[PDB]
Amino acid sequence: TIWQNYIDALFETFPQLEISEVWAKWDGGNVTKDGGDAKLTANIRTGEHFLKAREAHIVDPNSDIYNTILYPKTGADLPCFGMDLMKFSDKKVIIVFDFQHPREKYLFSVDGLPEDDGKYRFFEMGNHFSKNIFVRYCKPDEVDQYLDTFKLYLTKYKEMIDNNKPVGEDTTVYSDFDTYMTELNPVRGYMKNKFGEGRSEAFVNDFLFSYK
Numbered sequence: 059t060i061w062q063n064y065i066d067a068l069f070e071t072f073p074q075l076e077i078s079e080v081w082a083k084w085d086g087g088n089v090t091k092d093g094g095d096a097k098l099t100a101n102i103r104t105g106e107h108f109l110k111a112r113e114a115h116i117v118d119p120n121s122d123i124y125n126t127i128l129y130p131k132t133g134a135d136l137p138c139f140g141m142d143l144m145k146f147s148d149k150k151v152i153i154v155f156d157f158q159h160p161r162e163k164y165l166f167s168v169d170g171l172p173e174d175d176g177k178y179r180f181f182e183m184g185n186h187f188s189k190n191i192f193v194r195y196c197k198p199d200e201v202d203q204y205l206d207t208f209k210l211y212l213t214k215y216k217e218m219i220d221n222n223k224p225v226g227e228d229t230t231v232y233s234d235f236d237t238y239m240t241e242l243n244p245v246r247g248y249m250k251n252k253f254g255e256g257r258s259e260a261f262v263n264d265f266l267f268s269y270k
């Protein structure tokens with residue numbers, strides 16, 4: 059996968075996050091002699107200071123998408139750390155990552171990180187996305203140009219986690235957030251095409267954004 063260095067950086071920063079469940083291993087897309095050409099792996103990880111990290115990785119002949127959110131334990135008003143690393147074709151990649159605060163309409167920021175006040179195709183800036191939302195468009199062979207920046211975001215996130223050491227397990231903290239992410243989101247339709255209506259619905263509601 060072109061995302062392997064991002065994935066390794068994430069779990070180098072947070073080595074406590076171990077796989078606790080494989081929620082799905084699915085084949086879909088066009089069926090050939092070998093089976094479906096689209097593959098989904100959906101993992102749940104757990105570990106010190108986190109409620110869960112949920113990691114979805116979808117790969118087919120043209121695309122490679124890694125959608126992952128880290129949900130910290132509650133009690134410290136911490137944001138989640140979210141990423142949507144999207145290769146759509148051999149020419150087109152979009153990288154998104156951000157601190158996603160669970161409180162509706164609260165503008166979160168971190169001093170010293172890149173700032174972006176632009177407006178994007180889906181979602182509402184400033185509402186569960188921060189002043190430092192990082193969105194870049196590039197080609198597949200260029201993605202690691204932004205790796206050092208992703209590593210800075212991870213460094214600041216680990217500082218927040220380690221400085222607070224949250225122990226709460228109140229999943230309702232994330233209900234507004236998971237509801238917002240569900241409504242606003244191109245995922246559902248793409249998954250329905252490749253994997254079918256029922257599998258798409260369960261993926262969005264019971265795996266990606268299950269704290270609604």
Ligand SMILES: C=CC1=C(C)/C(=C/c2[nH]c(/C=C3N=C(/C=C4\NC(=O)C(C)=C4C=C)C(C)=C\3CCC(=O)O)c(CCC(=O)O)c2C)NC1=O
Nearest residue numbers: 123125140141142152154155156178179180181244245248
């Ligand atoms: C698994 C399948 C999957 C699909 C099909 C998907 C599609 C998808 N996500 C998008 C944007 C986006 N996606 C995000 C962000 C996220 N979205 C999230 O689900 C999470 C967890 C974040 C975390 C940061 C944002 C902010 C945009 C708008 C950026 C843009 O318009 O380029 C767009 C618009 C891109 C554009 O045309 O510019 C598409 C098509 N994302 C996926 O993960």
